[PDB]
Write a protein that binds this ligand. Structure first.
Ligand SMILES: *[C@@H]1O[C@H](CO)[C@@H](O[C@@H]2O[C@H](CO)[C@@H](O[C@@H]3O[C@H](CO)[C@@H](O)[C@H](O)[C@@H]3O)[C@H](O)[C@H]2NC(C)=O)[C@H](O)[C@H]1NC(C)=O
Ligand SMILES: *[C@@H]1O[C@H](CO)[C@@H](O[C@@H]2O[C@H](CO)[C@@H](O[C@@H]3O[C@H](CO)[C@@H](O)[C@H](O)[C@@H]3O)[C@H](O)[C@H]2NC(C)=O)[C@H](O)[C@H]1NC(C)=O
Ligand SMILES: *[C@@H]1O[C@H](CO)[C@@H](O[C@@H]2O[C@H](CO)[C@@H](O[C@H]3O[C@H](CO)[C@@H](O)[C@H](O)[C@@H]3O)[C@H](O)[C@H]2NC(C)=O)[C@H](O)[C@H]1NC(C)=O
Ligand code: NAG
Ligand code: NAG
Lengths: 115, 473, 101
């Protein structure tokens, strides 16, 4: 799953097998690293725009500012809605995508940018 | 052979062949025609009217049409929001009305000319409550589909304040196929006593789904509140040992019933069945049994009022009938042994609250009776069987199971050699030898696999969770 | 002939008028809530009573505001269940050990 996107002013970040449904049982990490004094602007492109009536687990895309499982939780995104664009100067937006044992969806498309 | 005609309304396909209900209705007319034991001196004819589904004004039209031709009784259509209109016409015009689908009786409707052969879900809910309390459950989990399922199980949902129960409630989504999100939820919550409430077609529709997420195992224990449960295709399930329990008002022990159902199968596969949905081909649904038993109770009423005639009442001639008052009482006092067994009517409300139920369950062979129920008595159960242990307990070879391990120096080792090998054939050690003897003495079909977390597994202070084998177990 | 009918209250009476009006076109404007049968295709009615599929969500919001962990529902007749179905499903997700009488 690893697409090492280190040292880019901007670049493509996306779920595996993006135009297809993402594979099951996948717990793969992604890490965004910014040089000192920079700002991270994460652009996220949803594939499908619908309004869910519920929020659930089993497939969750959370965002962290710092090392994983050890930095404060920013938010934990799921469903088919496009999350709002996240602007922080924590300089380390490290993002993990999970997978349950079934029930794949349309995946996601994102774009990281550095200033 | 006096002339007598019955109103037949049948919300139907508006295309294709005849529905089950109308055929079962005509079957009754023909049978009553042949065996002169009933109405030897009177021959009853019949008229049928076909309407769109769920159009009350449309039903009222045809009700007025039949009443113009004159009838004895109108066998009401099988969905409520038309049943109400037809009933309100029949009551105001004096002709008795007989219904076969349960409706939500309005809170205080002062109607007096309607009887209902479908068992009251007050009693059915009570019996389901007794069955639940017999299996000694505590965490039951109702599931329904239509909004009215609440009203239908109100006698159950009030129970938590009396007995010791905790019960969630969920709803099947509007779409039938995607039950997966509900099933996923239910499996996560560890719900192992599920009460479904849906017409048996929908039940078969969700049983496949339950199979795909592997709930169909020895853990889960569904109770199906519907009545036509035998129509299910039991075969892909009867060897996985789940504990399904339904009911069957359809008495099928009498040889007479066996013969009648059989000839029904002869004249019913006459119309094409469904090969994919998961239902038996050619089995008589309860909603047709109730049609059939309706005609018999009507005839048992009619045969004792020979003076009865067929006047041509008009909807605009609001003056009631000269035979309604006595005829209706005669009907309400009937008794009969139809395809559903005993037939009676609560004298107060003209509903039906007394009957005889055969509880059923899934044994290994198939659906087979394991007791009886009726409102008067309690729940009598005859599953007092005893089984001395076969030496190869639990299996010759059935119910394949995965096993989970971890590498330990004397116990479990991956087989050491050059050529890579797969399956439960790449491991060696002590515990494997232990498992090996288990299969040779109990007939196991085991797949071996390792723990990804790779721990013994222990209690997690942060959240109460576990890891390793304990978590996955 | 009438431009539109402002129909009665009792649900059984309302259904017949709803059907007649849709079959003939004249709009029908209701005032009392009724659990419309979800298998009905008619289109010529609007009903002003605040439909309970939202009132129930509001009641749930209110109860949750109190941080209630136990609540007892008392209804009047059968249709109260339908009227509160969105509340009764709450123990599925949240923590509301509720009783009903
Ligand atoms: C009329 O149209 C609206 C959409 O404009 C339908 O709205 C849907 O209403 C349900 C509640 O009945 C919403 O579910 C709820 O969402 C909120 C916000 O996420 C949540 O806090 C509640 O716990 C509940 O999950 C649903 O989101 C909303 N939108 C959708 C997906 O359509 C409304 O149902 C329609 N009226 C009727 C009665 O059909
Ligand atoms: C005619 O209809 C009436 C109304 O349904 C029937 O009365 C009902 O009878 C049953 C059986 O006795 C009552 O159930 C009881 O409930 C209490 C709950 O605490 C329980 O402790 C008793 O053991 C029993 O289960 C039911 O409440 C009662 N309905 C009323 C009046 O509320 C009647 O049995 C029907 N039959 C005839 C032929 O009259
Ligand atoms: C599925 O059907 C099974 C039919 O036998 C039923 O099995 C057994 O039912 C009894 C009910 O009393 C349970 O009781 C046993 O365990 C208790 C507690 O230790 C003892 O006091 C009893 O004397 C008895 O040993 C059994 O637990 C249960 N299992 C078996 C095979 O003995 C299942 O309960 C049904 N449900 C499920 C979840 O499959
Ligand atoms: C239980 O049912 C069996 C079979 O119907 C019957 O022989 C037995 O007498 C019944 N026991 C009771 C409680 O009546
Ligand atoms: C289980 O045993 C039955 C009866 O012998 C047999 O029909 C079935 O195919 C077996 N299934 C498995 C899981 O081996």
């Amino acid at each position: 799953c690893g697409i090492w996107v280190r040292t880019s002013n901007g670049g493509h970040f996306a779920s595996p097998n993006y135009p297809d449904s993402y594979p099951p049982n996948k717990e793969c990490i992604y890490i965004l690293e910014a040089a000192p004094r920079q700002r991270i602007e994460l652009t996220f492109d949803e594939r499908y725009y619908i309004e869910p009536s519920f929020e659930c687990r089993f497939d969750h895309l959370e965002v962290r500012d710092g090392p994983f499982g050890f930095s404060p939780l920013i938010d934990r995104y799921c469903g088919m809605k496009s999350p709002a664009l996240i602007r922080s100067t924590g300089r380390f937006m490290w993002i993990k995508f999970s997978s349950d044992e079934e029930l794949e969806g349309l995946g996601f498309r994102a774009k990281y940018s550095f200033i | 052979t006096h002339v007598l005609r019955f109103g037949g309304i049948f919300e139907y396909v508006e295309s294709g062949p005849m529905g089950a209900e109308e055929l079962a209705f005509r079957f009754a007319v023909n049978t009553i025609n042949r065996n002169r034991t009933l109405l030897p001196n009177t021959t009853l004819t019949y008229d049928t009217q076909k309407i769109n589904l769920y159009d009350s004004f449309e039903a009222s039209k045809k009700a007025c049409d039949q009443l113009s031709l004159g009838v004895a009784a109108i066998l009401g259509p099988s969905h409520s929001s038309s049943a109400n209109a037809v009933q309100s016409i029949c009551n105001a015009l004096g002709v008795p009305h007989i219904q076969t689908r349960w409706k939500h009786q309005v809170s205080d409707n002062k109607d007096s000319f309607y009887v209902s052969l479908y068992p009251d879900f007050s009693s059915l809910s009570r019996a389901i409550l007794d069955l639940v309390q017999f299996f000694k459950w505590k965490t039951v989990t109702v599931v329904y589909d239509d909004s009215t399922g609440l009203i239908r199980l109100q006698e159950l949902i009030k129970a938590p304040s009396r007995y010791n129960l905790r019960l969630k409630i969920r709803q099947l989504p509007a779409d039938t196929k995607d039950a997966k999100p509900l099933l996923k939820e239910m499996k996560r919550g560890k719900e192992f006593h599920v009460i479904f409430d849906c017409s048996h077609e929908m039940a078969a529709g969700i049983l496949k789904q339950a199979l795909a997420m592997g709930m169909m195992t020895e853990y889960y224990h569904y109770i199906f509140t519907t009545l036509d449960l035998f129509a299910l295709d039991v075969e892909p399930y009867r060897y996985s040992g789940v504990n399904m329990t339904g009911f069957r008002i359809l008495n099928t022990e009498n040889t007479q019933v066996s013969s009648i159902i059989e000839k029904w199968s002869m004249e019913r596969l006459q119309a094409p069945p469904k090969p994919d949905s998961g239902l038996l081909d050619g089995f008589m649904t309860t909603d047709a049994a109730l049609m059939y038993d309706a005609v018999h109770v009507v005839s048992v009423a009619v045969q004792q009022f020979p003076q009865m005639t067929v006047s041509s009442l008009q909807c605009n001639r609001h003056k009631p009938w000269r035979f309604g008052t006595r005829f209706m009482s005669l009907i309400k006092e009937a008794h009969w042994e139809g395809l559903t067994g005993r037939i009676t009517f609560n004298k107060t409300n003209g509903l039906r609250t007394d009957f005889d139920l055969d509880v059923i369950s899934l044994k290994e062979e198939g659906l087979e009776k394991i007791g009886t129920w009726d409102p008067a008595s309690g729940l009598n159960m005859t599953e007092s069987q005893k089984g001395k242990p076969a030496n190869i307990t639990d299996s010759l070879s059935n119910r394949s199971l995965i096993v989970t391990t971890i590498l330990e120096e004397p116990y479990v080792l991956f087989k050491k050699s050059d050529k890579p090998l797969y399956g439960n054939d790449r491991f060696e050690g002590y515990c494997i030898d232990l498992l090996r003897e288990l299969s040779t003495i109990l007939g196991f079909t085991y797949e071996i696999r390792l723990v990804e977390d790779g721990k013994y597994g222990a209690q997690d202070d942060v959240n109460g969770q576990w890891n390793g084998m304990v978590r996955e177990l």
